[PDB]
Design a protein around this ligand. Structure first.
Ligand SMILES: OC[C@H]1O[C@H](O[C@H]2[C@H](O)[C@@H](O)[C@@H](O)O[C@@H]2CO)[C@H](O)[C@@H](O)[C@@H]1O
Lengths: 416, 142
């Protein structure tokens, strides 16, 4: 069970978790209440697993897109800031963490991907994707490359896929149409085809991941990368002279990154709900609290107005906002879970050449099927189902199943 | 009370047809689903399918949930799957048997509907036709 009289916070490993732990120390100093900040592997998948059993952290940080799934499965407490407190944050950020008329988290910061470039290698970064082949060709002559970014997370390629018309779910009159997935259209195909052609013409490697792309940029090997505010910090400690700018246009259209609000949810099973509210409202969502995290790894454009006014002076933040404005706020509907993998597989398969673009995206449009009764359970399912089938090469997977079953059994509580 | 029987013959091995049989989320069929209880001398498996299917729609604004019970236990090639409608009014029961008949494979199904009813009957037969097609579909893409 969750421990009473103490706070345990989970946040993704790419964020300022050391800075958050400083805020935690401040909380502990004032109140005697210990605050422990951890960054578990696959935390977006772990949280639903543990929370389904009433276990896990008191507070969880993730982008808002996963929160509707978690709320629908009853893993998150409704939160209740006073009118006073709500006025301290931008309205639109609250809207991101509203689900079914209820607030399910505190908004922290607005995240968007930007184009990051090395000014000494590339004083004028390219304005279009279409220039990048020719740029790369020239840079390979010097033993460098034009661009490297994380291909293993569809987050990072999505801006290109969406630029000419790829989408996730249709939106009309305040409602997302889940029966329609826009991941198989001509715009989505064009975008992915461009990426696949970059790989076919040797301008990119199909297995480039976050750390490879990070190491390549910060060691001066590649002239550009694509990443969020959190990454600026490690470039700062390298000797690279970097600019952060608007993503390249594609077919004359802006890249359309998916915009996340980093959000902090309270575990519905936590016995420390008031302490969590104290910590989030009076310690983290303050100029000094956000500064401490931001100093560890930049948050992006923060939800807190008082501090955003200061951050907005930074041209990296203005770039972040220009990209966010050209992009689209992620839905927080429970189906996002299935969408995200559905694309994760398609991109990897098209990039590696296991599937053609057309067949990979065609398969994704189906695999985006919502995929579970339990809103937050879709990954535990995909992990399990994937095994049971492999087992049907026998006719083992029990370890996944116990986990899968709990999550969906908890949702089955409020139905028949 | 409307009844349906049909058998369809599958130009595919029993094994592959049963493997496909286990997969939903085909382009022909919308409904979401998951495996709630499974145990194995034999194999049993228990699922819940939410199936989505305008006065009638008003009557069921809320999504309708389907329960499947299926066993594949005998070394002799076999599956049985049983579907019920979770609501307050009238039932449907569909049972499929998949075994291969002269290895191609063939199923024999029933739909039993209780409470118009003609629409319900027409719909559940159409779903069964779609289903054969989805299994045919799933082979290609598995
Ligand atoms: O790639 C799919 C992934 O996209 C988004 O995740 C971002 C996340 O918003 C950031 O916190 C950052 O760490 O990078 C992630 C990609 O690795 C969605 O939040 C997430 O739900 C989705 O899985």
């Amino acid at each position: 069970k969750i421990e009473e009289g103490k706070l345990v916070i989970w946040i993704n490993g790419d964020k300022g978790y050391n800075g958050l732990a400083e805020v935690g120390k401040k909380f502990e100093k004032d109140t005697g209440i210990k605050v422990t900040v951890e960054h578990p592997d696959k935390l977006e998948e772990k949280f639903p697993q543990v929370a389904a059993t009433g276990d896990g952290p008191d507070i969880i940080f993730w982008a808002h897109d996963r929160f509707g799934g978690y709320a629908q499965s009853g893993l998150l407490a409704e939160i209740t800031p006073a009118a006073a407190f709500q006025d301290k944050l931008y309205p639109f950020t609250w809207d991101a963490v509203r689900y079914n008329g209820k607030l399910i988290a505190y908004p922290i910061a607005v995240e968007a991907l930007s184009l990051i470039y090395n000014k000494d290698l590339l004083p004028n970064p390219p304005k279009t994707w279409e220039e990048i082949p020719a740029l790369d060709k020239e840079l390979k002559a010097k033993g460098k490359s034009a661009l490297m970014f994380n291909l293993q997370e569809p987050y990072f390629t999505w801006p290109l896929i969406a630029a000419d018309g790829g989408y996730a779910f249709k939106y009309a009159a305040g409602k997302y149409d889940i029966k329609d997935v826009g991941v198989d259209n001509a715009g989505a195909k064009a975008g992915l085809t461009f990426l696949v052609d970059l790989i076919k013409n040797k301008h990119m490697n199909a297995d480039t991941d976050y750390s490879i792309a990070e190491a390549a940029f910060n060691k001066g090997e590649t002239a550009m990368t694509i990443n969020g505010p959190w990454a600026w910090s490690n470039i700062d400690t390298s000797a690279v002279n970097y600019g952060v700018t608007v993503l390249p246009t594609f077919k004359g259209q802006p890249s359309k990154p998916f915009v996340g609000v980093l959000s902090a949810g309270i575990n519905a099973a936590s016995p420390n709900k008031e302490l969590a509210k104290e910590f989030l409202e009076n310690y983290l969502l303050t100029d000094e609290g956000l500064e401490a995290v931001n100093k560890d790894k930049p948050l992006g454009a923060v939800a807190l107005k008082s501090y955003e006014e200061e951050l907005a002076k930074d041209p990296r933040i203005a770039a972040t906002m220009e990209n966010a404005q050209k992009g689209e706020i992620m839905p927080n509907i429970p189906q996002m879970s299935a969408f995200w993998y559905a694309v994760r597989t398609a991109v990897i398969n098209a990039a590696s050449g296991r599937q053609t673009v057309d067949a990979a995206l065609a398969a994704a449009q189906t695999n985006a099927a919502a995929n579970s009764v339990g809103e937050a359970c879709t990954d535990m399912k995909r992990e399990y189902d994937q095994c049971f089938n492999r087992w049907f090469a026998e006719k083992p997977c029990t370890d996944l199943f116990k986990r899968y079953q709990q999550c969906v059994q908890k949702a089955i509580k409020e139905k028949e | 009370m409307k009844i349906w029987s049909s058998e369809h013959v599958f130009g595919h091995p029993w094994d592959t047809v049963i493997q496909a049989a286990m997969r939903k989320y085909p382009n022909p069929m919308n409904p979401s689903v998951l495996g709630v209880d499974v145990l194995q001398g034999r194999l049993h498996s228990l699922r819940l399918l939410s199936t989505e299917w305008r006065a009638i729609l008003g009557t069921s604004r809320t999504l309708t949930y389907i329960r499947e019970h299926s066993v594949v236990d005998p070394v002799e090639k076999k599956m049985e799957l049983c579907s019920t409608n979770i609501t307050l009014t009238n039932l449907v029961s569909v049972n499929e048997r998949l075994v291969y008949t002269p290895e191609m494979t063939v199923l024999t199904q029933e739909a039993i509907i209780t409470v118009l009813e003609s629409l319900m009957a027409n719909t559940i037969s159409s779903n069964a036709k779609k289903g054969w097609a989805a299994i045919e579909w799933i082979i290609e893409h598995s």
